[PDB]
Design a protein around this ligand. Structure first.
Ligand SMILES: [Mg+2]
Ligand SMILES: [Mg+2]
Ligand SMILES: [Mg+2]
Ligand SMILES: [Mg+2]
Lengths: 291, 291
């Protein structure tokens, strides 16, 4: 059980020695903006060399996988199989193929061109893609809320019209409320657009990304992993740490991102055990030592 | 205590005889869309004749008072003093004048031209009104969320930038999630835009409209009313009925609008006493009899 222990010395070595695999969140962990965490590529190099599986779990729904993979090599993370990378965009598309109801249905998407590429790559028909001949607009059977920078009250109204049908799915890529920018400003996240959609429609979204356990289901379609033998490394307690707890993983908080150690200990004193990390490190560069 | 009694016979007569005043909600009560509830103007006529004060309490933030008053005469409700009409737009403006912090501050508004007129009529300086000379844009000290049909992710981002300052007020006109249209469709309400703003900013809005007690404070600046001797008539349990309970008023549900009797009795069996009306009537036309 999580007691927010600084991960070091012999403990660090046993924890890493025993682990078969590490799941990493990206922003606030491997990098912040245009800047790699110094020593982060070297940890990834050293884990591969130790024969430990590294995978990446992101709530990003802005970019399709091939462009998400770009960011890795660009910030010094070479040698990555794009199969190592799981985003809310990819997993939302998979979940939609799995669950889309109706006869052997179009998805109305709140989101950008990257998200759309991803959904189409999975065989999904999107509302507002061109119609066959001059036949009817296909029946909309899911509403997907992603990171939509061009969100408007009109799209909100349209989403709710589709959701009047109770057989129409409501799905969210993630519930991230906001995102820190390099210049100290914040950007609204998908969770804020999902809150608007949920309120106006009176529905609860099915959530794809962390802390939803479905993100783990998604990862373990392509890979067997023993979550008991898997570390989850993230910077955000309500997302990455909570997720790791829900999956039965050992959790590690890195202090290079959103959450402060102060908050992690707050929650422990308040006995909120699934928002408490098992370990914390100043930065993931402190983990290389144990290898 | 509210036991959802059909209001009739001698009971109706004592309830109306004793009451010094009636507060009416508008949509779903006096009218639906372009259509007056038959017998609703006649109830208003008869109440005035009995010497009972009628006032109107609306969560509408779309239209300034002089245009809100138009709708009354237009749907058969002549003889109304605009002083009888209290909307979330008017009361938000009053609250902002009362609370705006900072030296003896601009309001950033999410809302239309009616709301803006109302705020200016109260002496408020709005962000995005033209600047003095070529001096700086004035410091924004309140964010107001109203019914904004041109809501966008960009306005959402800007609202959150202003709210980074914790001395910057967050205010909502109302939390109405959605609104029924004549054609059976629904429109997203201010509560959905307020949910987005609250999520992206991590703040809780100060709420002006029903069921907020502040709406009552607003009404009782212009009038003394004994809420113990005042009836509150509305169609929406979570707004009009809850409000009336919070104010110490006798509440009456009309079935011409949003809430169903089924839901009112549900809540009573669940012992949720402040979402239970004291009385209900099929339509407010059934109330004239008691006079
Ligand atoms: Mg992160
Ligand atoms: Mg810290
Ligand atoms: Mg109403
Ligand atoms: Mg009914």
């Amino acid at each position: 059980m999580a007691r927010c222990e600084r991960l070091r010395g012999a403990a660090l070595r046993d924890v890493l020695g025993r682990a078969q695999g590490v799941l990493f969140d990206c922003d606030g962990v491997l990098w912040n903006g245009e800047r790699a965490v110094p020593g982060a590529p070297e940890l990834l190099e050293r884990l591969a060399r130790a024969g430990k599986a590294a995978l990446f779990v992101s709530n990003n729904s802005r970019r399709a996988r091939p462009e998400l993979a770009l960011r890795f090599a660009r910030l010094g993370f070479g040698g990555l199989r794009a199969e190592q990378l799981f985003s809310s965009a990819l997993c939302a598309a998979r979940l939609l193929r799995q669950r889309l109801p109706g006869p052997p249905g179009a998805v109305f998407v709140l989101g950008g061109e990257g998200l759309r590429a991803e959904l189409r790559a999975a065989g999904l028909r999107l509302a507002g893609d061109p119609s066959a001949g001059d036949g009817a607009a296909p029946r909309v059977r899911a509403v997907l809320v992603g990171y939509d920078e061009h969100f408007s009250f009109a799209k909100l109204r349209e989403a709710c019209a589709h959701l009047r049908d109770p057989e129409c799915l409501l799905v969210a890529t993630d519930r991230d409320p906001w995102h820190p920018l390099s210049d100290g400003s914040r950007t609204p996240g998908t969770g804020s657009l999902a809150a608007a959609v949920e309120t106006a429609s009176g529905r609860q979204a099915l959530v794809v990304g962390k802390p939803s356990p479905y993100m783990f289901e998604c990862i373990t379609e392509n890979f067997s992993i023993d979550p008991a033998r898997t570390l989850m490394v993230g910077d955000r307690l309500e997302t990455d740490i909570l997720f790791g707890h829900r999956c039965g993983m050992t959790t590690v908080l890195t202090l290079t991102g959103v959450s402060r150690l102060e908050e992690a200990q707050a929650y422990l004193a308040a006995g909120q055990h699934d928002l408490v990390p098992h370990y914390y490190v100043e930065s993931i560069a402190d983990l290389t030592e144990g290898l």
